[PDB]
Amino acid sequence: NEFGIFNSLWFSLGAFMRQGCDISPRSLSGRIVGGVWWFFTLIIISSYTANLAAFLTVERMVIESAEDLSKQTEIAYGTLDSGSTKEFFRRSKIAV
Amino acid sequence: EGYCVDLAAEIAKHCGFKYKLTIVGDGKYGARDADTKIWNGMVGELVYGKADIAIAPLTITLVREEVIDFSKPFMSLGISIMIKKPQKSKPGVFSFLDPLAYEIWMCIVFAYIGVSVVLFLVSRFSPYEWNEFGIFNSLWFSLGAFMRQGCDISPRSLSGRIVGGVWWFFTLIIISSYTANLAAFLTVSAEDLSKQTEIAYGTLDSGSTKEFFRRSKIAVFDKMWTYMRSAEPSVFVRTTAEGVARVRKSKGKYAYLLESTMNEYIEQRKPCDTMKVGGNLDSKGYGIATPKGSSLGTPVNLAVLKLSEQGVLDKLKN
Amino acid sequence: KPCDTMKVGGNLDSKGYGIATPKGSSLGTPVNLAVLKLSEQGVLDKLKNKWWYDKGECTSALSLSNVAGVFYILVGGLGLAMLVALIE
Amino acid sequence: NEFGIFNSLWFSLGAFMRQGCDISPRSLSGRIVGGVWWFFTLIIISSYT
Amino acid sequence: DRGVQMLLTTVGAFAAFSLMTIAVGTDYWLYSRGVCKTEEVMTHSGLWRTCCLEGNFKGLCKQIDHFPDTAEYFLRAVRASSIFPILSVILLFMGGLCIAASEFYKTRHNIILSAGIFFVSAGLSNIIGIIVYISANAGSYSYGWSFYFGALSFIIAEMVGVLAVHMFIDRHKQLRA
């Protein structure tokens, strides 16, 4: 009924999992420790859920044309030397 | 006004000749009767001398080439299926389970049973313990932990506490993921046609589509051809707009087989109440035509190729 | 395979592969009819399927796979618990 | 104590606000009522967030 | 009411053993849509043989090819050799044997506890098996009556374990008198 080492570990584990407690500190020192662990738990679990949501939401949203290729000079693009492709590009009149 | 009229304009420009735009009274592109060997519509007109050229959405095929000279296609296409775009979906009762797959829910239940039984066994099996955890109370503890709710009794033994800890961790990960995935959601063919006899499908009466189905040998198209030849009343229509209205006025119970270009145009035009589904059964192209021995045949090919290279046809299409 | 590359965007221009013959060839007339006959019969599609598809070597709910690990940990724990109790 | 009307209103409010309990039903019927209220709370609060 | 408890537990053990064995032996675990013996048609795939139906040559079927990052290798191995479903079957067998031996060599009232432990462990093994099976399948579909036979075996096994433990508790209660 009092916080021995085993009961102390059970109180802490349960507080991290937000799963309620069968007993809580009653002294000023115990309450300081408890409050700080409670704050740490709130921030850390809220952050776990928020970042999981970000992971799933971002993936569910996933440069793709000739103009984007012409703008990007870092990427190199080429064609067969003698082909309808080289002639098509040579005789083309589109800007890209 | 239109695409074919413009095209004929640039073709006459490159060739230099003149043109007089004329419609056909029969309102048919053309076909041949295997018994009378007679030609209808544009092809009958060009072969029988009533005209000299067809800058139209005419489709190329073996039979028409045997009698007239086509050009290189100025636009490519394929047969396609048109249906009454279905309405949007309503969430649904029991949609509150969608954030997690069916298997996750099933295994959650099996694990609930197991955790409860193990807690009951460990809590009260040794005679030296004789722990308020009977099987009923064990089940209550586990359910309440999953719903992140009150406890009212907590295991005191070492083994009971191991079981409780793992059930707590499991609950945190699973519920957190249900909530997170809720957010995600809250912030983001022919064979099937041949199988379904309730849905009705038809084609233009005289056109490359009807002939392609009639001359086909593939299983699906053969079943479709038998159905059309037997589906009473006649699913066939006389004009594209007729099929458009029939699909738009059959509550999704009619399908129309036609060229992909017209589907693209219609779905892009209001009321926007129909859609193109699946892929193209056959690939072909629209081709300018001229009767055998016309002097225009040679230069029209060159005109089409020049327009294609210049990119004019793309601009007209857009 | 090795499937080490991918296609981006769509087709810049549209064209077609076409058999060729010299000016005035006796083969030119029949090759056109042969191509049309093969297209109608569906032979070209069979060849295409044999040489392209037959050589094939290549939000939504969560799945047992995304969370299976937590199930493994749970069962492992239940086992350890039973062992500790029986040892005592 | 056991669930009188006042204590029962308190049990329900506390469950909805996910703020833990001081008592819980002990009988089969009480536990059925409690279970469905717990599930309802989980779905509604998660959906609000 | 002791005496009927023993009959209920014995019947349950036999039923669970039979259901789990039938589930492992039979091959209607998954109604997928794939290739039968080497066109895609439906199939009644199972733990060992992906078997065909509604096909040109329905009824002719083969042995699933389990194998085509050590984690994937380990999971593929554990799913190839249904070690978990098989272990569930062995455990249920030994549990039943203990329950039966609870009539001979009586007065030990320590073996029936062993029976309960065996039944519970069998259930845990069964669940691990289901998880690995579903996880590996992820490398439309549906589940057949073999899958649900396995699940029902899990439930009956857990209940028989709870009864066994209850009986062991009662025996030590009577002895303490």
Author numbering:
A (entry chain A): 569 to 630, 633 to 666
B (entry chain D): 422 to 551, 569 to 626, 635 to 764
C (entry chain A): 716 to 773, 784 to 813
D (entry chain C): 569 to 617
E (entry chain E): 5 to 42, 55 to 84, 92 to 162, 173 to 210
Reproduce passages from the article.
AMPA glutamate receptors (AMPARs), the primary mediators of excitatory neurotransmission in the brain, are either GluA2 subunit-containing and thus Ca2+-impermeable, or GluA2-lacking and Ca2+-permeable. AMPA glutamate receptors (AMPARs) mediate rapid signalling throughout the brain, and orchestrate various forms of synaptic plasticity that underlie learning. These cation channels assemble in various combinations from four core subunits, GluA1–4, with each contributing unique gating kinetics, trafficking and subsynaptic localization. AMPARs exhibit a modular architecture with a two-layer extracellular region connected to the transmembrane ion channel (transmembrane domain, TMD). The ion channel is encircled by diverse auxiliary subunits, modulating receptor gating kinetics, pharmacology and ion flux, with the transmembrane AMPAR regulatory proteins (TARPs γ2, γ3, γ4, γ5, γ7, γ8) being the most abundant.
A GluA2 mutant (F231A) increasing NTD dynamics phenocopies this behaviour, and exhibits reduced synaptic responses, reflecting the anchoring function of the AMPAR NTD at the synapse. The Phe231 to alanine mutation, which destabilizes this interface, slowed desensitization recovery of GluA2(F231A), both in the absence and presence of TARPs (γ2 and γ3). The role of B/D NTD interface stability in this transformation is supported by a desensitized (R/G-edited) GluA2(F231A) structure. The NTD dimers of the mutant receptor also transit into parallel O-shape conformations, and the LBDs depart from two-fold symmetry, which again is coupled to an increase of non-domain-swapped receptors (relative to the resting-state receptor). Rotations are larger for one of the two LBD dimers (C/B versus A/D), and movement of the B/D subunits is less pronounced than in GluA1, perhaps due to subunit-selective contacts between the NTD and LBD tiers. Transition into non-swapped LBD dimers probably involves relaxation of the critical M3 gating linkers of the B/D subunits, as observed in an NTD-deleted NMDAR structure, thereby entering non-conducting (‘deeply desensitized’) conformations. Closer analysis of the three sets of desensitized structures reveals a gradual transition of the LBD tier into four-fold symmetry, which is greatest for GluA1 and smallest for the edited GluA2 mutant: GluA1 > GluA2(F231A)-Arg743 > GluA2(F231A)-Gly743.
